[PDB]
Amino acid sequence: HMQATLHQLKVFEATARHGSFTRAAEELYITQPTVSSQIKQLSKTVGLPLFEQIGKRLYLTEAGQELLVTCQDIFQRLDNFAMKVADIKGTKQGRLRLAVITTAKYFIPRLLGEFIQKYPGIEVSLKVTNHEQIRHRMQNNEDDLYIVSEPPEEIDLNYQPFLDNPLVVIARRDHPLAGKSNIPITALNDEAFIMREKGSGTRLAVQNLFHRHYVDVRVRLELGSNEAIKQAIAGGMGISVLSQHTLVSEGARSELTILDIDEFPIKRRWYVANLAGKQLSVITQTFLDYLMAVTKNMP
Amino acid sequence: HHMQATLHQLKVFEATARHGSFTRAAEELYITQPTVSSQIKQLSKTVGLPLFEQIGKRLYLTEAGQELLVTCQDIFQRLDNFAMKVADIKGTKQGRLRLAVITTAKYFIPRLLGEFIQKYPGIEVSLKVTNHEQIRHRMQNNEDDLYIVSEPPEEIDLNYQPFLDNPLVVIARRDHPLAGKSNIPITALNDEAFIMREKGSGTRLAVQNLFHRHYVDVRVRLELGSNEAIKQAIAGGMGISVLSQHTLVSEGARSELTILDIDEFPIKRRWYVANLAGKQLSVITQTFLDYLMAVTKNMPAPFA
Amino acid sequence: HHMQATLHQLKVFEATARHGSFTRAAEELYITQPTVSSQIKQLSKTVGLPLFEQIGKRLYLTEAGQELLVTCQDIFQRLDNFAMKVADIKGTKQGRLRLAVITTAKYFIPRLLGEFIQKYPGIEVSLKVTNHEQIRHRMQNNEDDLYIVSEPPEEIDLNYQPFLDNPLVVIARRDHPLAGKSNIPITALNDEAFIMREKGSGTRLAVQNLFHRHYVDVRVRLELGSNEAIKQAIAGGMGISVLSQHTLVSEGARSELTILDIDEFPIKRRWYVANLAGKQLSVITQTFLDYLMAVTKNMPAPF
Amino acid sequence: HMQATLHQLKVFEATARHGSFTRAAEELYITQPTVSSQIKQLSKTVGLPLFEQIGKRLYLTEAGQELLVTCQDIFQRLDNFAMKVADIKGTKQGRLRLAVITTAKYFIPRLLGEFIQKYPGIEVSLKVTNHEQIRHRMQNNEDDLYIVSEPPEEIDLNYQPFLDNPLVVIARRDHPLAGKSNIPITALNDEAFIMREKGSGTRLAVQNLFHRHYVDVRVRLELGSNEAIKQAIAGGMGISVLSQHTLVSEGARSELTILDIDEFPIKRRWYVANLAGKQLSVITQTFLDYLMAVTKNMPAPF
Numbered sequence A: 001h002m003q004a005t006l007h008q009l010k011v012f013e014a015t016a017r018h019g020s021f022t023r024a025a026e027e028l029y030i031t032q033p034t035v036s037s038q039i040k041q042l043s044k045t046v047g048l049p050l051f052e053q054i055g056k057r058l059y060l061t062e063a064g065q066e067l068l069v070t071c072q073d074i075f076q077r078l079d080n081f082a083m084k085v086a087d088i089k090g091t092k093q094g095r096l097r098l099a100v101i102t103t104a105k106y107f108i109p110r111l112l113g114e115f116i117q118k119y120p121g122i123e124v125s126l127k128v129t130n131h132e133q134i135r136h137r138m139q140n141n142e143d144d145l146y147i148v149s150e151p152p153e154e155i156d157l158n159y160q161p162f163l164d165n166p167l168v169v170i171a172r173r174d175h176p177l178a179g180k181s182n183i184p185i186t187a188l189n190d191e192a193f194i195m196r197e198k199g200s201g202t203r204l205a206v207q208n209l210f211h212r213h214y215v216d217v218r219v220r221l222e223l224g225s226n227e228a229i230k231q232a233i234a235g236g237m238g239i240s241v242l243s244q245h246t247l248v249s250e251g252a253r254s255e256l257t258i259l260d261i262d263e264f265p266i267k268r269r270w271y272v273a274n275l276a277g278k279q280l281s282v283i284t285q286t287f288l289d290y291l292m293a294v295t296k297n298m299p
Numbered sequence B: 001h002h003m004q005a006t007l008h009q010l011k012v013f014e015a016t017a018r019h020g021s022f023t024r025a026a027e028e029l030y031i032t033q034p035t036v037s038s039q040i041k042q043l044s045k046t047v048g049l050p051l052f053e054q055i056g057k058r059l060y061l062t063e064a065g066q067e068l069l070v071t072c073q074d075i076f077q078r079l080d081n082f083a084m085k086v087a088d089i090k091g092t093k094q095g096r097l098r099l100a101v102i103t104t105a106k107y108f109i110p111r112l113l114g115e116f117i118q119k120y121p122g123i124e125v126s127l128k129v130t131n132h133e134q135i136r137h138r139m140q141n142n143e144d145d146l147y148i149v150s151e152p153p154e155e156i157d158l159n160y161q162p163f164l165d166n167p168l169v170v171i172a173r174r175d176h177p178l179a180g181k182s183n184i185p186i187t188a189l190n191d192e193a194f195i196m197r198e199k200g201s202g203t204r205l206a207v208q209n210l211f212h213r214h215y216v217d218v219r220v221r222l223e224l225g226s227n228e229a230i231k232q233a234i235a236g237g238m239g240i241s242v243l244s245q246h247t248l249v250s251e252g253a254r255s256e257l258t259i260l261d262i263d264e265f266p267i268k269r270r271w272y273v274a275n276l277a278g279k280q281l282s283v284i285t286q287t288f289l290d291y292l293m294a295v296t297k298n299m300p301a302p303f304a
Numbered sequence C: 001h002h003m004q005a006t007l008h009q010l011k012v013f014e015a016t017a018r019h020g021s022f023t024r025a026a027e028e029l030y031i032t033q034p035t036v037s038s039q040i041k042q043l044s045k046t047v048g049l050p051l052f053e054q055i056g057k058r059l060y061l062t063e064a065g066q067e068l069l070v071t072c073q074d075i076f077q078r079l080d081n082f083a084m085k086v087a088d089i090k091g092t093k094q095g096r097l098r099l100a101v102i103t104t105a106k107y108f109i110p111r112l113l114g115e116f117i118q119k120y121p122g123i124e125v126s127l128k129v130t131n132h133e134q135i136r137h138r139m140q141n142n143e144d145d146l147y148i149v150s151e152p153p154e155e156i157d158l159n160y161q162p163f164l165d166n167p168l169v170v171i172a173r174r175d176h177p178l179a180g181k182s183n184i185p186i187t188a189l190n191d192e193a194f195i196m197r198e199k200g201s202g203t204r205l206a207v208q209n210l211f212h213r214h215y216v217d218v219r220v221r222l223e224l225g226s227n228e229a230i231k232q233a234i235a236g237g238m239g240i241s242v243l244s245q246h247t248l249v250s251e252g253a254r255s256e257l258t259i260l261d262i263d264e265f266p267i268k269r270r271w272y273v274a275n276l277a278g279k280q281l282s283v284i285t286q287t288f289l290d291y292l293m294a295v296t297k298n299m300p301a302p303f
Numbered sequence D: 001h002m003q004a005t006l007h008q009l010k011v012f013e014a015t016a017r018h019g020s021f022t023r024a025a026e027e028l029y030i031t032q033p034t035v036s037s038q039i040k041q042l043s044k045t046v047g048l049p050l051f052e053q054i055g056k057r058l059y060l061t062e063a064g065q066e067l068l069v070t071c072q073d074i075f076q077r078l079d080n081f082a083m084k085v086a087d088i089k090g091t092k093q094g095r096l097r098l099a100v101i102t103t104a105k106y107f108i109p110r111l112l113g114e115f116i117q118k119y120p121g122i123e124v125s126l127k128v129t130n131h132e133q134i135r136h137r138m139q140n141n142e143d144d145l146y147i148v149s150e151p152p153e154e155i156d157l158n159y160q161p162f163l164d165n166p167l168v169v170i171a172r173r174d175h176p177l178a179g180k181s182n183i184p185i186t187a188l189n190d191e192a193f194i195m196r197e198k199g200s201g202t203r204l205a206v207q208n209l210f211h212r213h214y215v216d217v218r219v220r221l222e223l224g225s226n227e228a229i230k231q232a233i234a235g236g237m238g239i240s241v242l243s244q245h246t247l248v249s250e251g252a253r254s255e256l257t258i259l260d261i262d263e264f265p266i267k268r269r270w271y272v273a274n275l276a277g278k279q280l281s282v283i284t285q286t287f288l289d290y291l292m293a294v295t296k297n298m299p300a301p302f
């Protein structure tokens, strides 16, 4: 019974609705003898008579009544799918999956929550993790878009930069250098310093810049957590270098401050990426556009 | 619209998704791979979204594809159902029983169901053996006349009752040092090489809870999702395990297995049969329900 | 034997394993991709087993690689520890406080620890911030002077004591129709956008439970394992969530966040300071422990 | 710090142990002035004196004393990794990961069980799953060996066949055709038959052979489960075709039997595969050799 055609079902259902081959033909802009043979073929496939002529009309047999609701269910299901596809296309349904490097937690979720108010039907997933996780997900095509800091050479990606990630010297509001301008980088000599964990991107960049300019800091502490570091600074433990976006909620009157040391900010970027040769969904390309938009004139 | 799709196109798509391969699909359907290729391109144009993405040497379903695949499986199911009604008409069948049972009831239901049709050749049967999730799915859609579960879901308005006990027992190979001994305390399982079921499993839960309650530390040698695989692993002397005693129904004259007589075993579970939200039952459904209740009333577990 | 190996070799290896890439490792170590490659194979012969395997464009660490990686990390830690004793000797310091604390305590311990240091300038400090499991290993290895945990482990013999409350609260944006309202029924939450923590977490469990133990069905809009990310999600209007009130300490003057006074909240949790049972506290430990207790005794939670 | 070499620590540790440069240099088959200059360089990088001479002997400074303990730990940790590498090479420790296609559940776990008895140090994972799951594992390199019916072309694999998977017609012991021989395949026409699920491997291989010999069976039931089917057979609901390894536990006095039909068994195979280019661990190669051996002689059940 898979040998039946959709077209033969479409003829059958019309022929049952109306009571005649001819009325059906007129609806389906085909010929009455095409309808009759289509029905004979379909009855041969089913194995039973579908119709009985009584007076001027074709009435359904038991097997025909069953096939009618079978046809109605099937056509219902296709319509339903057609509705899905239409909602997808007009960004009123669908799924957006983002995997994002850790440092981007300070903007991405907020952007993403703005975007959903503007497209409520969308369902979202956000994964916030490290470079190794992200590489794995990329290898398995798990998300629509990936936001990273350093696009992995060994994976075919389509990407571009969209937002600068300055690393800046952060201090407590009462530090001597606070408010001072054009401060030479040698001024960091002998300063209590809170270092990020070994093997961190941030650590490595901070150390490289410090080796280049002969600066020797007193490492008071080593932590793995930017929040922890901000807190340690507040507590007087020292200064550090962190991504400026860690300062997003800080206002006019803050316990923290940026120092204005020369050779800073250490300049780094965030990229958007998708796998090379990927079919970008409607909402993905929509989101991509909205992203580049809101982060172009973003301080 | 979407009535421009053909049933052949959906067959080709549904087999491609299933196999993850134009080649394997073409083999199944007795067609050339370019036929597969162009049928998919055509259908894909008709829908107006991509259904597949080929990233490297790997084929993936898009969102729209994932959604069409469910649509194809519903449609095909409905055509199977119609084919069955037709056979039932042709054979002047009195009507058809619809049963969905939890996985572990495959070791008593099918056989029992054979012996039930013996008594009424006027009746036909559609047995679905599946997990709890799929049973709850079928339950929301009124898909079946009776449901057999280990744990009736709290989401649904059911009319359930228990009918057969499901004792979980310790199983070893006939040559195990504790084999044929009596009244062994549960502490003797300390350090035994043990084969655990997979993580989400309620069998695993029941066992992990009971062992935690008795401060029993076993050496987990293996995790397996399959009862049959476990039984085979026990036969090869990998260790012992805890399984539903009914899994021994399929254990023949060549079997090396035995039940160790451990204190606080069996873990007592049972099976429930369930109607749905006070909806009345056919004469068939009730003739079967009475059958179930009779035959199982005093049915001994295997290896008694 | 393995004394044939070189520390530079081990340093090249560990960077390769860490990066998943000879090129990215080569950039970090200020050297050449051929030299990384060279130095790894030189090391591989010495070991007697392959340390990596390349399938397609993917670089995988072998079983011997994975073992070597752990060995390299232990070794490098010991060298870093030696360098700290040296800087302590040469800095003519009074001594060093070692402290390991549960992840959620980063929102008070590091600040407090600064202030303590300002009070005792001869003391150096090591602050490890990590999860519960890892605090157990560290406990078993007598690694630290004091441990701060959300629940003391049963398998370890510990003197302990609670010192600060950990209220979990409902957090929302200040434009929310429930902002500024008193004595709100818990049932007001149901059918509301909600950001849920990751599966099998202290926090998610403790709110799924209290939502079924007071009959509340919520619309889960997102899943995140980062507290900061959730707060950012709330600022963007994504929904509400339940977080430790202490996560609000880093919420500056531009914050658009608030706590909703929902009935049957706060969910109440605690922090405990613990040491190994019977084991004498150093003068330094003791001085800190006293400072801790004083400062936290009447410490109000943020907002 | 970390400009220090490992040989500098080794020379340092000998020097502390003997209390002289000379006795240390004799142990390391090097000269006395290499030792001195080595220690002096190390003393520079450390930033403090490591030794002081008291009387006839070099004694450790405070820094020296700490350096000695950190050296003994480093050397210790380094020897441990060598014990592991040695244990691995001689199969006394290590990991074997197998992922197998569903139907191999009736034999792989048993063999694996027998194998582990010989090598008790080894940890094992066995994953029993479908072709799609197996492909994902193959793509992410999650296991040592894969056991499959049909290796997927789009993945680079070294593979070889090792055991036949005959599909045979199965009935209840009282079936009319039981005991018979050279039964015509057309005997099955009109016969009550229990089919495997749509899209199965087995259902396809069965529907090929039936369309080819114009065979029309009375499909009484469809089921997803080999165990269920065997039970349904036993309950009188029909006959079916299943892999012969389903019958592994059945002895001479079984409620089941195999019907000796023309064009049967449908011959299918199992293969062992690993990814191409990948080099097999020592325990993996061991297992492979063992698998081929025990299967070479192996008869199907009954």
Ligand SMILES: O=C(O)CCC(=O)C(=O)O
Pocket: A105, A224, A225, A226, A227, A228, C106, C225, C226, C227, C228, C229
């Ligand atoms: O940056 C930190 O320390 C916080 C770590 C984090 O992901 C968070 O709590 O969101």
Ligand SMILES: O=C(O)CCC(=O)C(=O)O
Pocket: B106, B225, B226, B227, B228, B229, D105, D224, D225, D226, D227, D228, D229
């Ligand atoms: O074969 C069946 O019906 C299911 C068998 C099973 O689930 C198992 O292989 O463990």
